[PDB]
Amino acid sequence: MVQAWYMDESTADPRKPHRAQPDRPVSLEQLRTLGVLYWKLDADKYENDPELEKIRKMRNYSWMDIITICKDTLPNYEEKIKMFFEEHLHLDEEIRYILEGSGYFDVRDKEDKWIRISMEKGDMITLPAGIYHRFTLDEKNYVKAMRLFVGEPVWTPYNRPADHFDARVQYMSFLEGTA
Numbered sequence: 001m002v003q004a005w006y007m008d009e010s011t012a013d014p015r016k017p018h019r020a021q022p023d024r025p026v027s028l029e030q031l032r033t034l035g036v037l038y039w040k041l042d043a044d045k046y047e048n049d050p051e052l053e054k055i056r057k058m059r060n061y062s063w064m065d066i067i068t069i070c071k072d073t074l075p076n077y078e079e080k081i082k083m084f085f086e087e088h089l090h091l092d093e094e095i096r097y098i099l100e101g102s103g104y105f106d107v108r109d110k111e112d113k114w115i116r117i118s119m120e121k122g123d124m125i126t127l128p129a130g131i132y133h134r135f136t137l138d139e140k141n142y143v144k145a146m147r148l149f150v151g152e153p154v155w156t157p158y159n160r161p162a163d164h165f166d167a168r169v170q171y172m173s174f175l176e177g178t179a
Ligand SMILES: CSCCC(=O)C(=O)O
Pocket: 067, 069, 084, 094, 096, 103, 134, 135, 143, 144, 145
């Protein structure tokens, strides 16, 4: 099952697991209280998968593309990787479905503590508009992912602080309503 955990207090080597000690695992149920949703799929079938279609139709994910994060392949790699890992929010959902490889999505919990979510092949996640988050490769230094979007995409990150946005205000309001 998909693994997530509270992080330790080391700021070094962000691609390491950084598991809090003792272990403080985080469940999919706790992630849902943050508005973070998850589906498990057969990533070998991504070109033609009725199960992915069920999710895309339910959620109105009408747009997709594929991105490959690789030190050799990706244009403007070093700058893009830095922008992924700066703590930021978006005014839309961030939806990613991992097709190959792996990485970490970090999200803030209700007390603004970091939770690290380990995403591997077959894992699909949506991070709600307004949530503070970041992404890093793990020590294997490779991921291929499908990006999805509700309509034509706008990718703009707003690096924290970004508290004035309506999307952030509405998200804070959502958090009051969950466990
Ligand atoms: C696993 S997708 C690569 C990360 C990314 O697209 C993002 O942070 O927006």
